[PDB]
């Protein structure tokens, strides 16, 4: 989990983000991934930081980055839409 | 043995004796015949001891099941109904049970009368037991719907006093409970001799 938090630190410091956010929630959101895919997450939060005019990346830019890459980019854009659990 | 209960404007009055004999021999005088079912339900022992004890305990069980499943207090009519369903399955097999079912409903006062013969009925005044006809005498004399609380207390208390006075089988303590809207309330339990020295003058 925490090597992934370390890579969150690596690709977090290497770009313009906001230093008021967390990453353990994202390491929970990443079960099985490479740090290159973590970099794809960080660049995708960069893409939401392009859409809105953002240079201090919020938590939600990473939230939509992971919900993009792992969920809305797994096969199509729909792995969920059933509750049944919660 | 004689129990009675009646509902009126201010809730339900539940009155009973406590004499239990064995034929011609007194077992005890301290027998709580009114089986307290719930904080919101009360039942009687009218014929059969472990029949009323068992079967009313099982019904208290079952209403607990109902209210735990449905998050909701049971009606009196359904409990009397399922009681009659449970008693019916042993019809003719030699069971004495003629109890009274007392409680409060969202519809208001709840009074039902279920027998071992499947004689599940509602009504307003009831009395079961050997000298129960005495209690229909003096109670149905003194009955009104618009009585007060202590009025019904001395009415039913007087009625138990007459019934236990005339019957050879009735006596002991005088248990008096009062079902309200929110839930039942114990009133008192009085000796027959105390109501004798009191009520003779």
């Amino acid at each position: 989990l925490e090597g992934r938090t370390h890579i969150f630190k690596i690709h977090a410091r290497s770009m313009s983000v906001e230093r008021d956010i967390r990453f353990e929630l994202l390491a929970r959101l990443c079960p099985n991934s490479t740090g290159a895919e973590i970099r794809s997450v960080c660049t995708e939060a960069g893409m939401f930081a392009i859409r809105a005019r953002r240079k201090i990346a919020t938590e939600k830019d990473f939230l939509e980055a992971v919900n993009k890459v792992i969920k809305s980019y797994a096969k199509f854009s729909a792995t969920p839409r059933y509750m049944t659990y919660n | 043995t004689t129990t009675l209960a009646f509902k009126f404007r201010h809730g339900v009055i539940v009155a009973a004796d406590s004499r239990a004999t064995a034929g011609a021999y007194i077992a005890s005088q301290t027998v709580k015949k009114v089986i307290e079912i719930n904080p919101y339900l009360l039942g009687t022992m009218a014929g059969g001891a472990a029949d009323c004890s068992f079967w009313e305990r099982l019904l208290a069980r079952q209403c607990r099941i109902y209210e735990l499943r449905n998050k909701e207090r049971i009606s009196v009519a359904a409990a009397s109904k399922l009681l009659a369903n449970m008693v019916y399955q042993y019809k003719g097999m030699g069971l004495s049970m003629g109890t009274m079912i007392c409680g409060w409903d969202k519809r208001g006062p709840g009074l039902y009368y279920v027998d071992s013969e499947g004689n599940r009925i509602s009504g307003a005044t009831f009395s079961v037991g050997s000298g129960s006809v005495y209690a229909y005498g003096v109670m149905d004399r003194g009955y009104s719907y618009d009585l007060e609380v202590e009025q019904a207390y001395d009415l039913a208390r007087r009625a138990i006093y007459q019934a236990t006075y005339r019957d050879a089988y009735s006596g002991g303590a005088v248990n008096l409970y009062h079902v309200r809207e929110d839930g039942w309330i114990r009133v008192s339990s009085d000796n027959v001799a105390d109501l004798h020295e009191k009520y003779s003058g």
Partner: protein, 228 residues
């Protein structure tokens, strides 16, 4: 491989209750804490729709007047266990005039936690958190779909349970107090949840010795939310 409940591994058994252990983590989280002052408990609801009525979702039920519960993942088998458990405690009072002890409650469920059988059905997919106050006072219990029960002092389950247990072990000790464990617990909750903490995300479950009844907080809940 090990495509059934009847074929072990050359190493272990037929990991399929193990597959249900995998099927716990997809469920939402819940945290129970045993304080000597009382066992407190909370859960995350994860409401999706505005039509999704929040009180329609249950996580804490009242088994006994001092016994609550908490589920995981699949709901309906757990509901079967709740119905069975209330039946069996009702048998214990029915035949003993007294409360079944929460441990014997848990073992009583844990007998047919594994009585799965399709001949001579399928295993279950729910971990359970139990809160009670026996004669030994506050009790916090946790079992598994395999029924291998152990008592925990403060257990976190469901999704994100790892850092909840770890950060729990950061903050838990024996001489805790109740409302401290409450606000600390919801600190961990808003750390591990993804939404903004409000009245609708969570619910509380608070058994006490003097407050055996009402394993719950109603809108005081909102006040404790705005107290953090």
């Amino acid at each position: 491989y090990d495509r059934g409940v009847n074929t072990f591994s050359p190493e272990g058994r037929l990991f399929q209750v193990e597959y249900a252990i995998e099927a716990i983590k997809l469920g939402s989280t819940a945290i129970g804490i045993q304080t000597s002052e009382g066992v407190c408990l909370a859960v995350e609801k994860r409401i999706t729709s505005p039509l999704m009525e929040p009180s329609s979702i249950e996580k804490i039920v009242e088994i006994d007047a001092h016994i609550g519960c908490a589920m995981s993942g699949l709901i309906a088998d757990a509901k079967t266990l709740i119905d069975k458990a209330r039946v069996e405690t009702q048998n214990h009072w029915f035949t003993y005039n007294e409360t079944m002890t929460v441990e014997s409650v848990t073992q009583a469920v844990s007998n047919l936690a594994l009585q799965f059988g399709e001949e001579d059905s399928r295993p279950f997919g729910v971990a359970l958190l139990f809160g009670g106050v026996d004669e030994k006072g506050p009790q916090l219990f946790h079992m598994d779909p395999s029924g291998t029960f152990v008592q925990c002092d403060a257990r976190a389950i469901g999704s994100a349970s790892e850092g909840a247990q770890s950060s729990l072990q950061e903050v838990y000790h024996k001489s805790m107090t109740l409302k401290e464990a409450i606000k600390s617990s919801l600190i961990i909750l808003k750390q591990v949840m993804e939404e903004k903490l409000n009245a609708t995300n969570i619910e509380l479950a608070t058994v006490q010795p003097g407050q055996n009844f009402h394993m719950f907080t109603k809108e005081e809940l909102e006040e404790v939310i705005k107290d953090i």
